[PDB]
Amino acid sequence: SWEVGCGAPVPLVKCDENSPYRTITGDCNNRRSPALGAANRALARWLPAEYEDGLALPFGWTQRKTRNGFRVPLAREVSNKIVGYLDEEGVLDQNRSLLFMQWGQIVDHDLDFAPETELGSNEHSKTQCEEYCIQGDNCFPIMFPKNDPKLKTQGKCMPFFRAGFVCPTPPYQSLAREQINAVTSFLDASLVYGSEPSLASRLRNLSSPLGLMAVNQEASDHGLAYLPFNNKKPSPCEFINTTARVPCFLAGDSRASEQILLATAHTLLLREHNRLARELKKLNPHWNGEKLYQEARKILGAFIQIITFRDYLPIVLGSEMQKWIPPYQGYNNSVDPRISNVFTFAFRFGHMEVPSTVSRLDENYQPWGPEAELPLHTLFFNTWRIIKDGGIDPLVRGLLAKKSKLMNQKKMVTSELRNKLFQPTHKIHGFDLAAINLQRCRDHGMPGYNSWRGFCGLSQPKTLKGLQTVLKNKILAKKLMDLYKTPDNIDIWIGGNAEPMVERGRVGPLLACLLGRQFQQIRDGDRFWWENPGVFTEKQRDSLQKMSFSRLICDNTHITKVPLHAFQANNYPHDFVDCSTVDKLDLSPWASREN
Numbered sequence: 262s263w264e265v266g267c268g269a270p271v272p273l274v275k276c277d278e279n280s281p282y283r284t285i286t287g288d289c290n291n292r293r294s295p296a297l298g299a300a301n302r303a304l305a306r307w308l309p310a311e312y313e314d315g316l317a318l319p320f321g322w323t324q325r326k327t328r329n330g331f332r333v334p335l336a337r338e339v340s341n342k343i344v345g346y347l348d349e350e351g352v353l354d355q356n357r358s359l360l361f362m363q364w365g366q367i368v369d370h371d372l373d374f375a376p377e378t379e380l381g382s383n384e385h386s387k388t389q390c391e392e393y394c395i396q397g398d399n400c401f402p403i404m405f406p407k408n409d410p411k412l413k414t415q416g417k418c419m420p421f422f423r424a425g426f427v428c429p430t431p432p433y434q435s436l437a438r439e440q441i442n443a444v445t446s447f448l449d450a451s452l453v454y455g456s457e458p459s460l461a462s463r464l465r466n467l468s469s470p471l472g473l474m475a476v477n478q479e480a481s482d483h484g485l486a487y488l489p490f491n492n493k494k495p496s497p498c499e500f501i502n503t504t505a506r507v508p509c510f511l512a513g514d515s516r517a518s519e520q521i522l523l524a525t526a527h528t529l530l531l532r533e534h535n536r537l538a539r540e541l542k543k544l545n546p547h548w549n550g551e552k553l554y555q556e557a558r559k560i561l562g563a564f565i566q567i568i569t570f571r572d573y574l575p576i577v578l579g580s581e582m583q584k585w586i587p588p589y590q591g592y593n594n595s596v597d598p599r600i601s602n603v604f605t606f607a608f609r610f611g612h613m614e615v616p617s618t619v620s621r622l623d624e625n626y627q628p629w630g631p632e633a634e635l636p637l638h639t640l641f642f643n644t645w646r647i648i649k650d651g652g653i654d655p656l657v658r659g660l661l662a663k664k665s666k667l668m669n670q671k672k673m674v675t676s677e678l679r680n681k682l683f684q685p686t687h688k689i690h691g692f693d694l695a696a697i698n699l700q701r702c703r704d705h706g707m708p709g710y711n712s713w714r715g716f717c718g719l720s721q722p723k724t725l726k727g728l729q730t731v732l733k734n735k736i737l738a739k740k741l742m743d744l745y746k747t748p749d750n751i752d753i754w755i756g757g758n759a760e761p762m763v764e765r766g767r768v769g770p771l772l773a774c775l776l777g778r779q780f781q782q783i784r785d786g787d788r789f790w791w792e793n794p795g796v797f798t799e800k801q802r803d804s805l806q807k808m809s810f811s812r813l814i815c816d817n818t819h820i821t822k823v824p825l826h827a828f829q830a831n832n833y834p835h836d837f838v839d840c841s842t843v844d845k846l847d848l849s850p851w852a853s854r855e856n
């Protein structure tokens with residue numbers, strides 16, 4: 262008797278099962294469970310939820326109440342003692358470009374979004390959470406430990422609001438609290454197109470017969486498109502420079518302006534759409550706008566899928582790739598394609614790959630102008646640096662020629678994120694993404710590190726000597742034991758990222774298992790996977806497989822010098838060629854004659 266049937270929320274489907282196009286919502290993908298993988302549904306649970314009261318309260322909520330016999334250490338204290346570091350010298354990944362970091366964020370944003378409880382608006386008790394550091398309801402503040410330098414400048418806590426959850430807005434109660442995924446679980450470019458029909462419509466240029474996405478009307482990048490601004494206020498990008506007064510961008514995903522490189526990437530994807538559509542009109546003057554919109558959408562979705570599985574995943578999972586993701590054997594509708602709640606924390610390995618600076622580069626890949634190199638913290642929610650300071654090309658060059666940060670057991674997350682994160686609402690480049698992640702694991706009722714090792718068939722250390730061996734690191738194991746007292750309590754974000762990386766990859770065994778399993782399911786449980794015969798033709802697939810990130814850049818920027826292997830580290834000029842040496846997407850196979 263599955264207590265399945267909470268809650269009402271989103272209108273529960275309307276299918277043309279036989280349409281060759283995805284819905285915007287993800288409904289109608291699976292024929293027998295038509296809501297599977299759709300936006301605005303509960304994140305999947307691969308293990309039962311672990312909550313202080315067994316139902317919804319996070320571990321850490323009640324001071325005297327222990328997890329497995331021990332107090333859960335403060336998320337900020339773990340961030341300060343384990344995750345932090347001062348010295349930015351020597352931290353970079355010698356064989357991953359900064360595009361490696363950024364593509365990972367793009368992928369994450371296509372697959373998952375668990376937004377915060379919205380209640381705080383129309384009310385100040387929300388502003389009171391921050392003002393007075395008071396725990397209650399969806400207020401779950403991150404308290405500072407003693408000796409925290411932020412006590413001298415910033416008060417006693419960093420406010421934190423709990424993630425939204427299904428049966429959604431009333432607090433309690435029935436089965437364990439299940440957080441929501443607000444985007445489609447399929448790898449479908451929902452971050453470009455939107456996951457809800459409201460937004461999908463707004464993003465489109467409905468005035469045009471070419472099936473284009475709306476572009477900025479106030480500014481251009483040497484005649485190429487920007488994303489449109491959001492006309493609603495206060496978007497925080499206005500607040501960060503009140504002289505420039507440049508709003509955030511409007512995109513398929515509301516996080517698109519969070520940081521400037523993400524917005525950059527969003528912009529290349531939007532241009533590519535409009536490129537594809539125009540090109541498809543030239544080839545098929547008889548197609549209407551809807552047809553044009555949908556066919557371009559379908560190709561861009563293929564693009565995202567192909568780059569991710571062919572170029573990105575093999576260099577994340579390295580030698581574990583083949584073990585969790587065998588060669589594709591066709592669509593299987595018995596597979597659950599939903600993103601799991603645990604994945605939303607496993608994929609935050611990306612946070613350990615973000616460097617402390619971003620560069621703008623000129624055409625000789627030299628520092629562009631006197632302010633060429635910028636600290637990452639000044640870029641959160643920053644659109645003015647694109648629109649008033651050179652467009653996206655100098656930033657895209659930096660993506661190609663600069664490097665991702667390497668995850669290092671002694672230098673985990675840069676201070677730009679760990680001390681200077683900007684959150685839109687109460688004035689300050691002062692939050693801690695690591696602390697947030699840890700607190701969020703607890704918020705989400707995450708099982709601990711040993712439960713996940715068990716799930717993956719991996720050994721479960723119970724002692725310091727055991728942990729030293731799994732981590733291959735004596736100091737890091739001792740520091741974790743001092744805070745957590747048992748490896749059973751280590752929060753999954755920090756335990757999975759603490760493990761030494763597998764050969765040719767950039768995550769450890771535990772993460773390789775959790776990431777690999779999720780990506781297999783999203784390929785296998787998707788009716789519209791690009792390789793599923795009949796979604797495209799053989800000739801279309803032959804053409805799609807010539808696509809690369811280098812070509813995306815060549816086609817939609819004024820950059821002409823590019824590497825062949827965009828994700829590896831590439832030193833200019835030796836690893837660079839010009840755009841005339843890089844294969845093009847041959848659109849001939851989409852010429853249709855309706856004679």
Ligand code: HEM
Pocket residue numbers: 362363364365366369373374375376519520604605606607608609610611612614615641694697698701
């Ligand atoms: C995965 C992933 C998440 C969780 C997505 C989900 O909601 O299910 C994620 C989250 C965040 C958040 C929200 C934090 C919280 O309230 O719990 C912020 C503010 C943030 C900021 C930035 N991140 Fe991130 N992040 C995920 C994945 C990745 C990856 C993966 C490869 C990278 C890289 C990345 C980078 C950044 C980033 C860079 C400048 C900022 C800022 N994130 N993330």
Ligand SMILES: *[C@@H]1O[C@H](CO)[C@@H](O[C@@H]2O[C@H](CO)[C@@H](O)[C@H](O)[C@H]2NC(C)=O)[C@H](O)[C@H]1NC(C)=O
Pocket residue numbers: 501502504505645649
């Ligand atoms: C806020 O944004 C403005 C607008 O871009 C920045 O000023 C520009 O930068 C340089 C020199 O300051 C010039 O090339 C532009 O013409 C400037 N415009 C104006 C109006 O000054 C300004 O630097 C930004 N300030 C901060 C603190 O972010």
Ligand SMILES: *[C@@H]1O[C@H](CO)[C@@H](O)[C@H](O)[C@H]1NC(C)=O
Pocket residue numbers: 356576765829
């Ligand atoms: C960089 O990584 C790729 C895998 O992407 C590998 O094939 C290549 O040999 C690596 N380069 C070096 C110098 O190790």
Ligand SMILES: *[C@@H]1O[C@H](CO)[C@@H](O)[C@H](O)[C@H]1NC(C)=O
Pocket residue numbers: 466468469471473474475476477478
């Ligand atoms: C929509 O396309 C039309 C015709 O191609 C163009 O004139 C207009 O600027 C576009 N509008 C938006 C908002 O992008």
Ligand SMILES: *[C@@H]1O[C@H](CO)[C@@H](O)[C@H](O)[C@H]1NC(C)=O
Pocket residue numbers: 593594595596
């Ligand atoms: C489809 O997946 C389910 C669950 O993983 C499995 O029982 C079934 O054997 C799979 N089908 C094929 C052809 O592998």
Ligand SMILES: [Ca+2]
Pocket residue numbers: 371372444445446447448449450451452
């Ligand atoms: Ca999606």
